[PDB]
Amino acid sequence: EGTGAALGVEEPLLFLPLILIPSVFFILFLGFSNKQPKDDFFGAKDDRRN
């Protein structure tokens, strides 16, 4: 093409799978993140990861 539209989105229907599939796995990622330790560790690479 070469028009230059941001993210190749000329058609507005392409914001359907671009805003949903990240926010489907984001809710899955929040199921992992909310069950974590949330304690300021020291050193690097904390490995509790419940």
Q: How was this structure determined?
A: cryo-EM
- Cα distances from 18 to residues 4, 26, 32, 48, in angstroms, run 18, 12, 22, 32
- CA 31/CA 16 separation, integer angstroms: 23
In the chain, what's the furthest Cα-to-Cα distance?
50
First to last CA, the chain: 47
Positive or negative CA dihedral for 29, 32, 35, 40?
A: negative
Token digits for 15?
């914001």
- What is the structure's resolution, reported in angstroms to one decimal? 3.2
